[PDB]
Amino acid sequence: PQDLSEALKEATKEVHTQAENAEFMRNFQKGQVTRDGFKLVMASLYHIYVALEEEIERNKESPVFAPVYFPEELHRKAALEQDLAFWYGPRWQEVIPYTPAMQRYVKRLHEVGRTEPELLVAHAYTRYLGDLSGGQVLKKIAQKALDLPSSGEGLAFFTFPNIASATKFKQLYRSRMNSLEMTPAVRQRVIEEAKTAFLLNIQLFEELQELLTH
Numbered sequence: 001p002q003d004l005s006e007a008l009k010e011a012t013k014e015v016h017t018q019a020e021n022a023e024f025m026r027n028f029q030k031g032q033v034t035r036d037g038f039k040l041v042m043a044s045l046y047h048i049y050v051a052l053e054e055e056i057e058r059n060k061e062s063p064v065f066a067p068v069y070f071p072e073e074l075h076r077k078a079a080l081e082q083d084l085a086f087w088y089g090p091r092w093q094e095v096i097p098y099t100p101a102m103q104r105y106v107k108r109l110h111e112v113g114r115t116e117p118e119l120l121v122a123h124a125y126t127r128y129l130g131d132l133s134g135g136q137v138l139k140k141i142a143q144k145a146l147d148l149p150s151s152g153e154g155l156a157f158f159t160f161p162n163i164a165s166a167t168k169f170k171q172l173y174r175s176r177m178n179s180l181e182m183t184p185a186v187r188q189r190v191i192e193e194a195k196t197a198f199l200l201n202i203q204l205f206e207e208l209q210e211l212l213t214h
């Protein structure tokens with residue numbers, strides 16, 4: 001496919017199905033989630049977005065990422081910090097878990113950030129465009145299963161307040177990915193790193209399930 005947006009969607013089909021048939025998400029679809037499990041997800045998303053956004057800020061000026069840079073529209077660190085404060089208490093930053101599977105993901109983002117930033121779009125595509133697609137339904141499932149209090153906190157991550165229409169922004173975000181100047185050789189590594197990105201996610205759900213069910 002000529003468009004990067006199409007080429008990434010085409011390449012990741014087998015790895016996305018592999019991620020749908022992850023043991024954790026197999027249960028999540030049927031609404032078989034616990035508070036413990038959700039907390040782990042929420043903590044995972046924190047460590048990943050902290051690293052992703054840290055590396056994005058390093059490379060916002062660079063032509064390899066500048067077009068897809070949407071700080072205000074997409075930033076998730078603060079939303080997640082608000083949630084972890086509710087899930088783990090005001091001393092969340094001292095008590096939240098940092099598992100090896102999380103560490104691998106975080107290590108990759110920091111390596112891609114410093115040594116090959118032209119691939120950072122692959123992770124940005126995976127994380128943002130991924131979490132922008134599923135959030136609405138995944139919240140509806142979580143909300144039903146967890147039966148949390150009327151405290152008005154803890155699910156802030158699932159709302160992108162500076163994005164009016166998710167569908168229109170995804171359109172826009174795809175256009176900006178299509179406008180990225182890159183040799184058909186880097187084009188290869190972006191697709192390969194996107195595959196790597198999915199692998200790290202599935203690998204995470206596997207370590208999470210090994211922890212939750214003893």
Ligand code: HEM
Nearest residue numbers: 009016019020025028029125126127129130133198201202
């Ligand atoms: C419960 C497990 C999952 C299900 C049922 C699922 C299914 C879906 C659905 C229904 C969409 C909406 C399609 C759209 O309107 O664009 C989507 C999009 C997407 N998902 Fe998932 N998914 C799951 C897990 C994952 C994981 C673990 C990742 C990797 C981080 C991922 C990455 C993506 C991406 C990048 C898109 C946007 C595709 C595009 O438009 O280019 N998904 N998926």
Ligand SMILES: O=C(CC(c1ccccc1)c1ccccc1)Cn1ccnc1
Nearest residue numbers: 041044045130131132133134135138201
């Ligand atoms: O699956 C998605 C987010 C998912 C998740 C969590 C941690 C790491 C990677 C993914 C998650 C978020 C919040 C609660 C339960 C699960 C986005 N998605 C939906 C459809 N296609 C992509």
